[PDB]
Amino acid sequence: MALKRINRELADLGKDPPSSSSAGPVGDDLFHWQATIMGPADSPYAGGVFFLSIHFPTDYPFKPPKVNFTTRIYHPNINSNGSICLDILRDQWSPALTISKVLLSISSLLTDPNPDDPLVPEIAHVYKTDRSRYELSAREWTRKYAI
């Protein structure tokens, strides 16, 4: 369940290439993966590639993996540490949720920031109040850092 399931998920992701979201083994250690996310086209993060480190606890699938960002992003849900407070990895987790669902959920969060979970309440309030300034800041950050 901690190695056969991982091999099955890796084989499944190796069959159909999403061409936008990719996952790979860091060297040879099946409990540590790197995820590359393409920026959503209809989002201020358009054209910005993002990197994530995914840790598989040994109790997988009974315990969810941990994803951490590396590239900075002016987002109301991603601080400088690269943490992600995503409900799918703490509450809405079931043994059948493969790692592909996690990447798709993160992509959805990037497209549509969720103000119900203000990891950094300042940026969330700025977005709720000054939309244009928030989007300008996000695009400037994407240009400076992602590029």
Place this chain on the structure above:
Amino acid sequence: MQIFVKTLTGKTITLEVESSDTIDNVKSKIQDKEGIPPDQQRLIFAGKQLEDGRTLSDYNIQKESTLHLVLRLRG
């Protein structure tokens, strides 16, 4: 008509409602029969989440429809 709602714990609750009954009416019925506030309760039916301001007929709820109870938000 009559419908059935299953909670997260698997408890089955029978509700005497109608197709034209509003979502608010069913939420009030569930609150009266259980005590949970209507806003906290969310009903999943055929991939559709019931929302205030609509009716059961809007969600194609029919005789002996099975719904699922879920929550909304957590930190």
Place this chain on the structure above:
Amino acid sequence: SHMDEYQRKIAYMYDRPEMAVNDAQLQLKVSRATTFEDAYDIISKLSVSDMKKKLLIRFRNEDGLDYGGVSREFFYILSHAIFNPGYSLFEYATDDNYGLQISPLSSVNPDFRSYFRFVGRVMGLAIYHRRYLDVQFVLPFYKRILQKPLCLEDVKDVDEVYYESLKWIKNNDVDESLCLNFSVEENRFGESVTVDLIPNGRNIAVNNQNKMNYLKALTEHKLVTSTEEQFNALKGGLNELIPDSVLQIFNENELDTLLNGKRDIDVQDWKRFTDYRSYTETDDIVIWFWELLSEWSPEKKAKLLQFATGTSRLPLSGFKDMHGSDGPRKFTIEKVGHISQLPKAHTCFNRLDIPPYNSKEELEQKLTIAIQETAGF
């Protein structure tokens, strides 16, 4: 009532002729800097008759009165020493939900049985002399000590997400794609090894019929079979002083109250190990909040702690080593919120957002209303 019955049980237990101390005094000398080593050197080489006599403990180079307080501090320090996860004897169940359990890695020691018999002797001595340790284990542990069966719900205290996954497997049918079979992978200092719950269990995938047996096997292996020899040694040490016929008159919570005493959460430590955003102690809201916390019942303070952080169990060393979802994250108070809105909580960040109310009484009313639905202890 429950409390009166508990007092009756304690009186009957300590009134039994098989747990009566003698009139001889045992003197033990330890150094404050080195407590665990001295305790292991002395206690692990005594006799069953010796431990039953009156216990007198003096710290070396620390002469003073009120030997009761000195002994209490000694027991507190020793408990915080032996049960320290850094020593790799007892491990936290989860980093974000603190709870002590027997570490499966404790097999690394050449003779873990010696140290675990020492731990059993210490716990038996603590119960014998009406002295309290201050470590909070998990309920399945207390159920094991009383020799009670462990059902699936017992996994809830060990790990919430694990219990939710098990419950989901039980409720909904299991697809053939979920590669779940009778094989648990355990990692012990780098090397990960496969353990078979049943003979030739690594080649029997779960299905609709097998899922009940698989859940039973997983619960049994995670709660018992992992810590078999170590817990056997610990229970042997514990029963070396307290006869089991006395232990089995309690339940999984009366024993916890007997060990740790009436649990409480310190407030001065809480204040000294918090942090603020857009707030400072000069602000009136902060001082009102801390005064209200000072004058509150332990149950309500525990309820507020569970409402804010997400659990009622503190780390071993107080609020200092307070973890979060990703890494360390100390208790935080922030000035975010509209005037009319109720105080808000953020569990995975240990954060409490308090609106700037204009009266202390209003603040207390709003806080109580926000924590009304929370249940603590």
